[PDB]
Amino acid sequence: TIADPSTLVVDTVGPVLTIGLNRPKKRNALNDGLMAALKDCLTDIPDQIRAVVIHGIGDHFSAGLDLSELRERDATEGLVHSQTWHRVFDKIQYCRVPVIAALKGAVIGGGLELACAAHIRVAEASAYYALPEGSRGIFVGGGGSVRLPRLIGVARMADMMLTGRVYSAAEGVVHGFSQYLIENGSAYDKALELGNRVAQNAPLTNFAVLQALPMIAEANPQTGLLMESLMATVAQSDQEAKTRIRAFLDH
Amino acid sequence: AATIADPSTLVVDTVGPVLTIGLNRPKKRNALNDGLMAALKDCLTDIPDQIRAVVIHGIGDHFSAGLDLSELRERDATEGLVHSQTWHRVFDKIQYCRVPVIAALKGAVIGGGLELACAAHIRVAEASAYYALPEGSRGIFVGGGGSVRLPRLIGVARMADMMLTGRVYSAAEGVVHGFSQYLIENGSAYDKALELGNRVAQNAPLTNFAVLQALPMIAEANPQTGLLMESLMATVAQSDQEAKTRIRAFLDHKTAKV
């Protein structure tokens, strides 16, 4: 696989790295080229970048798997292929900086898996969510079975997969698909505002919320509690936190 | 669709309150196959009330050399998933048996035979017993519960080494690394296993319940949880009529002695 840079639009707007999925003729379907190029933009991110917005060019975030490029795979090949998708999504989930996905139109299959890997999702009214692979006998291979139940619970996912059930953006915000809904206006603009806001954070804030928080929450409570006192004491004792404490306190 | 039992592959007796189950394909060292496994599941289904222990043992010089290599059936990915699951359902009747299961080990205890042995609650090993997972040689992983049960006995590190290199362990080595709780250096694992079955036979049913089922769960729980669960198992056990009867008799015999 060679990364295909043509399938993305990458820009920097102040301290926000923006990454637009750019295959609007195929509704931003993910193929290997797209995913390898995306993996690249998320590697060795320049230090002036303090947030990432992933968005879609055109009406749609992503319709998921490229059905043209539909390949033929044995059990072994499919394990390797899914694992490669996982390694790309790892660059999102474990990004050094918060990744915010601006969702609109189709957020479907691997598109939804991709939105799941981001930290914050902002949904415009037109967005919708589906896991339509089930109808073709295909389970998810892009992290969805681990990431989406953490947002929406097993039972709603299981129903989606069994019946092809679709959710709107408006239903979706209540059920856990996104933290934000923009009923009138643009997901991209709001993600950019959010990007600019999270860009003000101390780096250790990011670490603690992006890395430590999901692990603390998932631990035995006694374990998570001690891990919390440790993360907190380290955060609090950092120079940046003292500088922020003093500035505010000084007036 | 289910596989039909071949009961001729097993020799089943009842000695007092011990159901004895002898693996009986000696010409192939008690190589496991679908009908033996189905017959096995049958013996452990609806085990009559008079039975208070199960000894599984091998006819011949060997316990089991594992999967019958003359009886390989070609299987796609889905089929091999279904087939693995099938074997798991047989071993669940050992692990979750209502009475304790003791495996008498001698000669070959390898591959599926080790996995069978792992499902048992207690293993007694004669000097000749030897342990291996030769499957890795053949490009293949275990499908009989071994990656779950065995590391709990001997740890991942020793398992991983056995699989990557074909390392074999004797009965003497094995009692030390965790393969068996007992070693019989002279005489017979069967004889020992049968005296153990007579001994567990004396236990109250709720003791078998707490030990066989609750204990593993409590021990792998997070500590605060296993602990509350222990208090709960403990109080139920202790407040049961069989327990009180035994405590009555224990304190009536010391007041008989005085």
From TrEMBL, chain B:
Biological processes, Gene Ontology terms: fatty acid beta-oxidation
Organism the protein comes from: Rhodopseudomonas palustris (strain ATCC BAA-98 / CGA009)
PANTHER family: ENOYL-COA HYDRATASE, MITOCHONDRIAL (PTHR11941:SF54), ENOYL-COA HYDRATASE-RELATED (PTHR11941)
Protein name as catalogued: 3-hydroxybutyryl-CoA dehydratase
InterPro entries: ClpP/crotonase-like_dom_sf (IPR029045), Enoyl-CoA_hydra/iso (IPR001753), Enoyl-CoA_hydra_C (IPR014748)
Keyword Membrane included in the entry's annotation: no
Record-stated family: Belongs to the enoyl-CoA hydratase/isomerase family.
EC id: 4.2.1.55
Enzyme class: lyase
Taxonomic lineage from the root: Bacteria, Pseudomonadati, Pseudomonadota, Alphaproteobacteria, Hyphomicrobiales
Pfam families: ECH_1
A Gene Ontology molecular function term of the record: lyase activity
UniProtKB keywords: Lyase
